[PDB]
Write a protein that binds this ligand. Structure first.
Ligand SMILES: CC1=C(CCOP(=O)(O)OP(=O)(O)O)S[C@H]([C@](O)(CCC(=O)O)P(=O)(O)O)N1Cc1cnc(C)nc1N
Ligand SMILES: CC1=C(CCOP(=O)(O)OP(=O)(O)O)S[C@H]([C@](O)(CCC(=O)O)P(=O)(O)O)N1Cc1cnc(C)nc1N
Ligand SMILES: [Mg+2]
Ligand SMILES: [Mg+2]
Ligand SMILES: [Mg+2]
Ligand SMILES: [Mg+2]
Lengths: 855, 847
């Protein structure tokens, strides 16, 4: 036969090999630190021969030049893992082509960005040699790359770019991308902060955020750009950024629940190479990318891959070939780019935005670069990486290299390049001198943020009977032909009955609170594991057609007024992924993104919220004091000793009470459905942006004593302290009381049952519903109504080192000494775990507490 | 031409055939003239010429029937070829005896579940019904490991089929499982606070049914927190491999202890610890030679559908990042499940890397046996109601093939059921005894009386001299050489600093024959450039570890000891879990994990809460892991200041952990030596210094190492050795850590003979007797203050403010706090604000 047919088969194999694996041979590293193949008779003598390619006939040397330029030069493209052939074709069409050369104006603009990037760092090195700044030197190309992402987003007519990033080049991005004034950055290095800057306890300069407007230089558009605050904990901000962006998209009616699919707010997420591979929150957050409750239409990721993590080499940081391999699980294309090629970096940035816009999905840019100085500017890296730093010492920086290229191209002269550098440096010097001339402020200890936010003087949470009845009737306003599951129908009928006749249970009180807020025009977002039905089969926020699987959400009917006009409200209820860290981070971010939303996250059991401990510690409990960032997220934590074991008993009340300070959070453990209703309505209507932690029930959901009357919803308010109904409404005599039992939560019902069984008129039980801030005035005023009390006990089912005792045992005798001197504890013994593993052992221990309280 | 269509068609089946494979038991979701034409293909024994008809039948059987194979993401062509050779050829047909054995495992699997359903209808058991093939699959993994002559299989798994695996794979007695359902436990079963039945572990010996080998099989305990045990399993296996001299640090590369890790579908996709643990798989400090993963993929997670649980096509897509092949297999085909299990073991043995089996199955009952799944999944449960189980279908096949008769099949099933009934009746006949409250485990482990931790001068000198015993031609970095010279000087002359005291402790243990494993972020050099446990040749990059020289006696014989020091990945959850597991796996090892700053250990909160602080009380599982947490107010911000002492003190109970904040290098040395030599297996939490590493006052004398012991309470040297008068003291300041040096400097500056400073070095268990004895030496004290740099809601005050007046009322009634105000964060963000607040504490203490 004709050997051209054999040779053509080898050409088809070569095309596939470059597309699939060319990235493994690409010249992406700026440091350059690192017989049985069947050729089917193809050799170097076939270079000028024409071959058939899939339609077209091309010379072998031309096929090989296109493949080598696309896949083996300064850009490594990974895309053949993508399922969708139209996405692979889209990328092939754009990378297997001769690129348009940037104009001289575009080249000068890129150089102006590299000048700003390096000169900002060398200026800080000269003025503040002894202060950490986490310089981007060796990775200056991140600045024209980020400029190109934002400029391309503006070109697509998008609304906003929200950035989250770590420390590397943070100050550089704040000054040269977001527009944080140089004077403000210099004031931080000077330690001369005005009262606004010195507010709260604060945080380090490389954790701060900023906002501004980016104005295009090559087009007629502009776009908002924001950079969010973050703690030191690397990658922890990743789900927070997604939540912030989702909330902004929902507000613009763009995105998943929106009237259009523009997803017009773009998350731009930066990462370090060691952190991106090592932190589990990265995979958890990528896992949210296509979920209906969390999708943001694609995140643009940039890894500042300086091939080091402090003193650790990549071989000790990851098991994958690339630090970006984790992102392939959601079908993201990956572009590995040589950080010493500014034009390739800008081109990849624009291609990434175009791909995100075309397919509304994630894209990753792996920018290979290096770290010019030590990990921080006081660290000596040659002790552990002598070879790498001997190579770095021989390298001209990307600014100098690009300047020489433009001089060589004839664009600029050496004198012009020198003058432009002196001008930028001269402007930094001028601003530095002005800041240094400012009057020095006296340094004072930091102050509590407690008084910065206060409840309005007038706020009622009660609703009328018509509102209760409307929410009850919504449960039976089924779509025509809908088949209700036979074991769900009694719940719907019971809700109509409770709305008109009382005995309202916990689950319905929660829906009365959320439904009445929706009717008043509020956006309510509720999510968590199995939250649509409820872990305890109690919520039924979504009901499923038994014959068709169609879904009906009764509370969504409250988003329309009886006359047919919208209230402006909405109910967004989702089953979350099986994640705690990313889910809690996302809801925290969502509440920051839309302060007017009611945002609730529900743990399956409170025992699993320790999986989100970094979010609780670094964002929820402390973001207001550290950054002035406000969140109104609600965490619902099912809690209570019921004999189900040490991981189905406790939400670790003691840990939240320990974290509490400065009125940063509200912490509550309501004992009645109406009090929970009023708590949620107060939180949604008070205009205070502070988190709420609620310890919620499990067996108490179906306790026939734990029900509320209609008048408790229509004629009452949130009560931080509750007395027994016999004293406030009944014929109970407070003067007969000699023993006071103080408690919180479901144990009240067991104590009250024991009091009734033994007719103990000498014992009274007082509940603390709001654990933090402690209701000092209401507690003192309640205790003053029992003048003959000789002894007081704090009673709890939790072990002695858990529950409220560790904080209350110390604080109650200090803040109210005339009431709580001599306060004693009644509880389970101190325990390493939250409870026994045995239901029978739980029952004996529970009875001991009750016997001790009445002994 | 037509051959061009064939080569691309072969690639299409290999790359994407899995997308069309018949893997779901529920089924809820160029020309025809070329068939007899011969084409050239790359056969497994050389180039072959095959009819297109035969190429297509092989590809459809390999990739589109009950097994979906994902492997073309793997970099190594030899691994793809290995898989092709085994999937694109005829599979070995099981013998009739092997088929009957698989059926006996399905019988045991289903009959155990239906028996518990009959006897204990109201108790959760997380049944494997709908996924019974996991039992012959696990049997096949373990049998294939025994066929390779491996030493042990260690299993970690969640709740799904846990009781079934304990009884039918590991050999936990049926009588013990029934006693758990009965709630009639003997005193050993009732020991500690305990845990739920589907969290418990067991160990036994597996004996091959057809071969001549045995193998050890163990299943580790775990909390409810799904996937949290994954890094613990890897640590336990690595410790066992290091002991057998197999694996990464071993003389052979057998990696002869196999991790077998089971997962649920929703948890495997959702929990970040999965990716963190996979990321450890090829790292020198953590590699275990490949984990075999089995996902029990029942296409549901409680009430949540897969479309709400993950963004990837498969729940296993995360594992592709470490190049693991993935085998998706139809759970209703027991022979395909066993065949994939054996293939996975063979692949793990050939390439010493991870393999994933995604077993597609269903969940016969609700999430738990009291839950109604048709409320949320009506369609799925209408389909499940029409399905014959895998046991019934496999029995019908064997009866149909003529392997067994219906009478033989029923007799075998009734024999197993009769034996369950007999054991159940025997357990039910036992008298029920009084149920008592659970008891503290504190007294279970006690320190031997007068444990000596001092070493002689020769030992100190040997460790100092080891720092300059450089290999021939080694070039020391010019800024590292002064540290080595200073260590030799300190070993002979004193003024021993914190960093060298740590290495004196570890070095002296290695010399005594102990394995010491030390790891953490940048731990080889040290975050504060203080450790230099490994030094790097300035010219060649070669590494030298001075403490490794202590593993050889001066006469040249080995001590039996070793120093394993690693830079960890940038992980806290998987790294802490791994070190906890390692300490469980080798109780004789000294295992230390170091946080870069203590502020980041909250990333491992699930491991601290669920394993470290509570595993002894819950499961009787003992760990001696050490956590080193750099801590101290130095003006570096709220994430570079605190290891959250207050949280560890709150978690503390029952003597479960030792918690310490030493103020001197010798006291830290004695703390580490006591921990390594006391024969007690309980974790140690140490709050370690940063600036105090280089404080010239924070140095120790040679006599502090050779003639002393760990001191839980320390007085000022002026009273124990100097000319200080204790009777002049009217104000006592109690403290812990570096603030002691600032308080002592202020006392010396103002000649405050009326003030004494007492340090509590061991925070938990509180040294009640030594504290009382010390305070009794100051008879004229009129006021006592607890002084700390931490905010009032942090540090030791929240626990000590409550416990000291209760446990020592004649000494601490009236105890007052001196500290920073209560704060939402651990500190101010400003170094200047920190400095003003620090001076306020010092001024208040002496005001
Ligand atoms: C381990 C670690 C760093 C190395 C990161 O390497 P890579 O991701 O490649 O980024 P790059 O630095 O190469 O660009 S910087 C950071 C630290 O905390 C600085 C960051 C910060 O505090 O904000 P440090 O004070 O310990 O140095 N640090 C401690 C650390 C540990 N664990 C977590 C979860 N977060 C952290 N901040
Ligand atoms: C969300 C959740 C479960 C669903 C798992 O689905 P999948 O991974 O597909 O497994 P399978 O059940 O389909 O086989 S079972 C488990 C729970 O905790 C039971 C497990 C246990 O407690 O040990 P529960 O009491 O809330 O039901 N539970 C709560 C839970 C939440 N978050 C974590 C980290 N761990 C958990 N145990
Ligand atoms: Mg890096
Ligand atoms: Mg509010
Ligand atoms: Mg499942
Ligand atoms: Mg020990």
């Amino acid at each position: 036969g004709d050997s051209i047919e054999d040779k053509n088969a080898r050409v088809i194999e070569l095309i596939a090999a470059y597309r699939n694996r060319g990235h493994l041979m690409a010249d992406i590293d700026p440091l350059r630190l690192d017989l049985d193949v069947n050729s089917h008779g193809l050799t170097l003598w076939d270079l000028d021969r024409e071959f058939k390619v899939d339609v077209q006939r091309k010379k072998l040397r031309d096929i090989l030049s296109v493949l080598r330029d696309a896949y083996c030069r300064h850009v490594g493209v990974e895309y053949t893992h993508i399922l969708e052939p139209e996405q692979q074709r889209w990328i092939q069409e754009r990378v297997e082509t001769k690129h348009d050369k940037p104009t001289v104006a575009e080249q000068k603009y890129i150089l102006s960005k590299l000048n700003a990037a390096e000169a900002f760092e060398t200026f800080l090195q000269t003025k503040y040699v002894g202060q950490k700044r986490f310089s981007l030197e060796g990775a200056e190309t991140v600045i024209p790359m980020m400029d190109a992402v934002i400029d391309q987003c503006a070109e697509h007519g998008l609304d906003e770019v929200v950035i989250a990033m770590p420390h590397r080049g943070r100050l550089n991005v704040l000054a040269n991308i977001v527009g944080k004034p140089y004077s403000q950055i210099f004031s931080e290095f000077e330690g001369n902060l005005n009262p606004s800057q010195a507010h709260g306890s604060g945080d380090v300069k490389y954790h701060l955020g900023a906002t501004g407007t980016y104005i295009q230089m090559f087009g007629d558009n502009d776009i908002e750009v924001s950079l969010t605050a973050n703690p030191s904990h690397l990658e922890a901000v990743d789900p927070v950024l997604e939540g912030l962006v989702r909330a902004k998209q929902d507000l613009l009616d763009t995105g998943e629940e929106g009237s259009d699919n523009r997803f017009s707010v773009v998350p731009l997420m930066l990462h370090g190479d060691a952190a991106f591979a090592g932190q589990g929150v990265v995979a958890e957050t990528l896992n949210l990318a296509l979920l209906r409750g969390y999708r943001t239409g694609g995140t643009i990721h940039i890894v500042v891959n300086n091939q080091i993590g402090f003193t650790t080499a990549p071989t000790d940081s990851r098991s994958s070939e690339y630090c970006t391999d984790v992102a392939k699980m959601i079908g993201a294309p990956i572009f590995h780019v040589n950080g010493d090629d500014p034009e390739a970096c800008a081109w990849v940035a624009r291609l990434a935005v175009d791909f995100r816009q075309a397919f509304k999905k994630d894209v990753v840019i792996d920018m290979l670069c290096y770290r010019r100085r030590g990990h921080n500017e006081g660290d000596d890296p040659s002790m552990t990486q002598p070879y790498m730093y001997d190579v770095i010492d021989t390298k001209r920086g990307s600014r100098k290299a690009y300047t020489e290229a433009l001089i060589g191209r004839g664009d600029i002269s050496m004198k012009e390049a020198e003058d432009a550098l002196r001008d930028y440096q001269g402007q930094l010097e001028r601003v530095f001198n002005e800041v240094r001339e400012l009057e020095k402020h006296e340094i004072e200890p930091s102050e509590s943020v407690e008084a910065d936010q206060q409840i309005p003087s007038k706020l009622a949470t009660a609703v009328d009977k018509a509102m209760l009845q409307r929410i009850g009737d919504a449960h039976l306003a089924l779509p025509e032909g809908f088949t209700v599951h036979p074991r769900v129908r009694p719940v719907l009928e019971k809700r109509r009955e409770m709305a008109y006749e009382g005995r309202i249970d916990w689950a319905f009180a929660e829906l009365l609170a959320l439904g009445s807020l929706i009717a008043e025009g509020k956006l309510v977002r509720l999510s968590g594991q199995d939250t649509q039905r409820g872990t305890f089969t109690q919520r039924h926020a979504v009901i499923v057609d038994r014959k068709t699987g169609e879904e009906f959400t009764p509370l969504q009917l409250l988003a329309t007024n009886p006359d047919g006009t919208p209230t402006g409200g909405k109910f967004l209820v989702y089953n979350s992924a099986l994640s705690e860290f990313a889910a809690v981070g996302f809801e925290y971010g969502y509440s920051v993104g839309n302060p007017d939303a009611m945002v609730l996250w529900e743990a399956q059991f409170g025992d699993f919220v320790n999986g989100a401990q970094s979010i609780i510690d670094e964002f929820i409990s402390s973001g207001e004091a550290k950054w002035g960032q406000l969140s109104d997220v609600v965490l619902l934590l099912p809690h209570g000793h019921e004999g189900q074991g040490p991981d189905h008993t406790s939400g670790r009340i003691e840990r939240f009470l320990q974290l509490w300070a400065e009125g940063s959070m509200t912490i509550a453990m309501p004992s009645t459905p109406a009090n929970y209703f009023h708590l949620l309505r107060r939180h949604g209507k008070d205009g205070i942006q502070r988190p709420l932690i609620v310890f919620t029930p499990k067996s108490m959901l179906r306790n026939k004593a734990a029900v509320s009357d209609i008048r408790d919803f229509t004629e009452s308010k949130f009560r931080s302290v509750l007395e027994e109904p016999m004293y406030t409404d009944g014929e109970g005599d407070r003067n007969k009381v000699t023993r006071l039992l103080l408690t919180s939560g479901k144990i009240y019902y067991e104590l009250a049952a024991r009091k009734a069984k033994e007719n103990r008129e000498d014992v009274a039980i007082v509940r603390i519903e709001q654990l933090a801030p402690l209701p000092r005035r209401r507690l003192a005023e309640t205790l003053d109504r029992y003048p003959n009390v000789k002894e007081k006990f704090w009673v709890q089912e939790e072990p002695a080192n858990q529950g409220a005792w560790p904080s209350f045992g110390l604080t109650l005798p200090e803040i109210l000494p005339d009431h709580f001197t001599g306060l004693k504890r009644i509880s389970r013994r101190a325990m390493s775990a939250p409870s026994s593993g045995s239901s029978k052992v739980h029952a004996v221990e529970q009875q001991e507490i009750l016997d001790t309280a009445f002994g």
